[PDB]
Amino acid sequence: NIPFTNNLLFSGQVLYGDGRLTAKSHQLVMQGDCNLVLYGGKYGWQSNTHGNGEHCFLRLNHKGELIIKDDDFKTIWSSSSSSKHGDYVLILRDDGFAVIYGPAIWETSP
Amino acid sequence: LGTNYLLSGQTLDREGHLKNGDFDLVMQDDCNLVLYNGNWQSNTANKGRDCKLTLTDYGELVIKNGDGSTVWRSRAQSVKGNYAAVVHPDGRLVVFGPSVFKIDPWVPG
Ligand SMILES: [Mg+2]
Ligand SMILES: [Mg+2]
Ligand SMILES: [Mg+2]
Ligand SMILES: [Mg+2]
Ligand SMILES: [Mg+2]
């Protein structure tokens, strides 16, 4: 597995049981109430899926889809985003935006 | 900028750091961009001064010297968009994009 970084969620990495991203005065949290909440910005945000599932978890795939599945892998919310296959990263930026970026079009070495 | 990211439109100024764990990318003052413990550098040492690292809207990291002159390019490109160079915890600098999805806590409706 891949070493967590505070404000990044690379493809493959998984948040749950309120694992959370942090960046200064913001967090984005894959809670236990199955709800993906961004505390931050002026008004924050949520996937709005309060208790629409049990044991949930957020996960970004290798085609830019950011998804919340439950314990038995039922999609609870998606970003409904998709592009080429490869490594993507979600950032929690200092401005409080949470944006996905990808794929890897240039790296410093393989 | 962000301590480990650089957004297209943002600049990693002279002597600037982006850092993640044991890996330290520096836009040094000998105009060489070096990622420390990353086995890699722009190899633009002495090739100018007051240099800057930038990110274009097509995914290129362009090193402009003091005034305006380009000194190094990634020479990898894509569509027009917001991009991100980020220091990967496994020790690479990797350009990412463009943006596929965006969450905006800064909008009333
Ligand atoms: Mg963080
Ligand atoms: Mg973000
Ligand atoms: Mg992202
Ligand atoms: Mg960047
Ligand atoms: Mg992208």
Side-chain angles (χ1 to χ4, degrees), chain A, chain B residues 1-48 50-109:
Chain A
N1 298 43
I2 301 182
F4 184 68
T5 292
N6 278 44
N7 65 345
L8 311 182
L9 188 74
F10 293 95
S11 305
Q13 291 186 309
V14 171
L15 291 208
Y16 70 93
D18 355 74
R20 61 163 174 190
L21 291 188
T22 324
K24 313 190 315 197
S25 195
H26 325 302
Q27 343 164 41
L28 178 52
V29 193
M30 172 75 286
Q31 306 193 170
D33 73 341
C34 208
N35 198 13
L36 186 71
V37 205
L38 177 71
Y39 303 91
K42 181 145 184 164
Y43 300 114
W45 171 79
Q46 59 153 38
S47 66
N48 205 331
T49 34
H50 189 310
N52 303 165
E54 255 196 330
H55 293 296
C56 290
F57 77 89
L58 188 77
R59 184 187 150 296
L60 169 78
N61 60 352
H62 287 80
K63 342 264 169 16
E65 211 191 325
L66 186 57
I67 328 162
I68 319 181
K69 297 282 185 183
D70 63 20
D71 184 37
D72 305 277
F73 291 107
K74 212 210 82 173
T75 287
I76 294 299
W77 165 107
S78 179
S79 54
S80 300
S81 61
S82 186
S83 163
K84 346 188 61 175
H85 156 87
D87 313 8
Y88 287 67
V89 64
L90 157 59
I91 286 162
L92 173 56
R93 335 189 321 197
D94 308 326
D95 39 30
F97 282 48
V99 190
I100 306 188
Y101 294 85
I105 68 182
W106 195 88
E107 70 184 25
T108 48
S109 285
Chain B
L1 48 162
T3 93
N4 46 355
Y5 67 82
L6 167 67
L7 298 183
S8 69
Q10 292 182 332
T11 321
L12 173 70
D13 211 344
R14 54 216 212 270
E15 301 148 5
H17 281 278
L18 293 189
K19 178 195 180 313
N20 187 356
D22 277 355
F23 305 99
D24 180 67
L25 180 80
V26 215
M27 178 79 281
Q28 286 180 166
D29 222 301
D30 64 332
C31 205
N32 191 340
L33 176 90
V34 198
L35 177 78
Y36 282 104
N37 287 293
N39 345 28
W40 182 99
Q41 59 184 307
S42 75
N43 196 33
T44 57
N46 303 121
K47 302 195 196 292
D50 306 37
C51 322
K52 296 183 168 356
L53 193 52
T54 42
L55 186 57
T56 50
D57 303 353
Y58 298 80
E60 237 182 358
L61 293 170
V62 183
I63 327 201
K64 307 202 156 303
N65 66 18
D67 304 86
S69 130
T70 286
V71 194
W72 186 84
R73 330 119 185 243
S74 180
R75 283 152 49 176
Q77 308 158 26
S78 177
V79 315
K80 195 212 200 304
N82 297 16
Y83 287 65
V86 289
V87 200
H88 187 71
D90 294 292
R92 296 169 177 111
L93 182 67
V94 182
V95 181
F96 280 98
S99 32
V100 185
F101 176 51
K102 144 204 160 198
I103 307 192
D104 179 309
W106 290 97
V107 53

